[PDB]
Short mmCIF file of N, CA, C and O in Angstrom, two decimals:
data_model
loop_
_atom_site.label_atom_id
_atom_site.label_comp_id
_atom_site.label_asym_id
_atom_site.label_seq_id
_atom_site.Cartn_x
_atom_site.Cartn_y
_atom_site.Cartn_z
N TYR X 1 -6.10 22.81 7.39
CA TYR X 1 -5.19 22.33 6.31
C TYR X 1 -5.40 20.84 6.03
O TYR X 1 -6.43 20.28 6.40
N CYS X 2 -4.41 20.21 5.39
CA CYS X 2 -4.50 18.79 5.07
C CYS X 2 -3.27 18.32 4.29
O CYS X 2 -2.84 18.97 3.34
N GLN X 3 -2.72 17.18 4.70
CA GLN X 3 -1.56 16.61 4.03
C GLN X 3 -1.98 15.41 3.18
O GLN X 3 -2.08 15.51 1.96
N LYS X 4 -2.24 14.29 3.85
CA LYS X 4 -2.68 13.08 3.16
C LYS X 4 -2.68 11.88 4.11
O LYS X 4 -2.08 10.84 3.83
N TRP X 5 -3.39 12.03 5.22
CA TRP X 5 -3.50 10.96 6.22
C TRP X 5 -2.12 10.52 6.71
O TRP X 5 -1.11 10.72 6.04
N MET X 6 -2.10 9.90 7.89
CA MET X 6 -0.87 9.41 8.50
C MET X 6 0.29 10.39 8.32
O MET X 6 1.45 9.97 8.21
N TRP X 7 -0.02 11.68 8.29
CA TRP X 7 1.01 12.69 8.13
C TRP X 7 1.63 13.04 9.49
O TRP X 7 0.95 13.03 10.51
N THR X 8 2.92 13.34 9.48
CA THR X 8 3.65 13.68 10.70
C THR X 8 2.88 14.64 11.60
O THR X 8 2.43 15.70 11.15
N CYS X 9 2.73 14.27 12.87
CA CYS X 9 2.02 15.10 13.84
C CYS X 9 2.98 16.03 14.57
O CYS X 9 4.10 15.64 14.90
N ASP X 10 2.54 17.26 14.83
CA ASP X 10 3.37 18.23 15.53
C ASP X 10 2.51 19.34 16.13
O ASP X 10 1.28 19.26 16.12
N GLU X 11 3.16 20.38 16.66
CA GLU X 11 2.44 21.51 17.25
C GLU X 11 1.36 22.00 16.30
O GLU X 11 0.19 22.14 16.68
N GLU X 12 1.75 22.23 15.05
CA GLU X 12 0.83 22.68 14.03
C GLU X 12 1.01 21.81 12.78
O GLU X 12 1.94 22.02 12.00
N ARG X 13 0.14 20.83 12.62
CA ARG X 13 0.22 19.92 11.48
C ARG X 13 -0.98 20.07 10.55
O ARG X 13 -2.08 20.40 10.99
N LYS X 14 -0.75 19.79 9.27
CA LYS X 14 -1.81 19.86 8.27
C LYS X 14 -2.91 18.85 8.61
O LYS X 14 -3.57 18.97 9.64
N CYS X 15 -3.08 17.84 7.75
CA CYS X 15 -4.09 16.81 7.97
C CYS X 15 -5.49 17.40 8.03
O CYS X 15 -5.72 18.43 8.67
N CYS X 16 -6.43 16.75 7.36
CA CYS X 16 -7.81 17.21 7.34
C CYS X 16 -8.44 17.10 8.73
O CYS X 16 -7.99 16.32 9.57
N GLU X 17 -9.48 17.90 8.97
CA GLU X 17 -10.16 17.90 10.26
C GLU X 17 -10.69 16.52 10.62
O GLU X 17 -10.96 16.24 11.79
N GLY X 18 -10.85 15.66 9.62
CA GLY X 18 -11.35 14.32 9.87
C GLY X 18 -10.25 13.32 10.16
O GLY X 18 -10.24 12.22 9.61
N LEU X 19 -9.31 13.70 11.03
CA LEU X 19 -8.20 12.82 11.39
C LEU X 19 -7.66 13.17 12.78
O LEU X 19 -7.50 14.34 13.12
N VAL X 20 -7.35 12.14 13.56
CA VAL X 20 -6.80 12.33 14.90
C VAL X 20 -5.30 12.57 14.83
O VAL X 20 -4.66 12.24 13.83
N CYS X 21 -4.73 13.15 15.89
CA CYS X 21 -3.30 13.42 15.90
C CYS X 21 -2.57 12.59 16.95
O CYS X 21 -2.77 12.75 18.15
N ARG X 22 -1.70 11.70 16.47
CA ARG X 22 -0.90 10.83 17.32
C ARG X 22 0.14 10.12 16.47
O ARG X 22 -0.16 9.14 15.79
N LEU X 23 1.37 10.64 16.48
CA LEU X 23 2.45 10.07 15.68
C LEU X 23 2.19 10.33 14.20
O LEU X 23 2.96 11.03 13.54
N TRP X 24 1.09 9.79 13.70
CA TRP X 24 0.69 9.96 12.31
C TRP X 24 -0.83 9.85 12.19
O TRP X 24 -1.44 8.99 12.83
N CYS X 25 -1.44 10.72 11.39
CA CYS X 25 -2.89 10.71 11.21
C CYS X 25 -3.43 9.29 11.02
O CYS X 25 -3.05 8.59 10.08
N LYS X 26 -4.32 8.88 11.91
CA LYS X 26 -4.92 7.55 11.84
C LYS X 26 -6.43 7.65 11.63
O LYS X 26 -7.09 8.52 12.17
N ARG X 27 -6.96 6.73 10.82
CA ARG X 27 -8.39 6.71 10.53
C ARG X 27 -9.19 6.38 11.79
O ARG X 27 -8.65 6.36 12.89
N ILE X 28 -10.49 6.13 11.61
CA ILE X 28 -11.36 5.81 12.72
C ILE X 28 -12.49 4.88 12.28
O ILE X 28 -13.06 5.04 11.21
N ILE X 29 -12.80 3.89 13.12
CA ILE X 29 -13.85 2.93 12.82
C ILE X 29 -14.63 2.56 14.08
O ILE X 29 -14.14 2.72 15.20
N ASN X 30 -15.85 2.07 13.89
CA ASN X 30 -16.70 1.67 15.01
C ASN X 30 -16.77 0.15 15.13
O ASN X 30 -16.84 -0.39 16.23
N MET X 31 -16.76 -0.53 13.99
CA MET X 31 -16.82 -1.98 13.96
C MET X 31 -15.43 -2.59 14.11
O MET X 31 -15.17 -3.24 15.14
#
């Protein structure tokens, strides 16, 4: 599924596969 980033995290939350789960979907960077 997918909500729109920084979306509420829970047992079963939307958010695209390209997002981690912790409080709210957070992006990811290397630099």
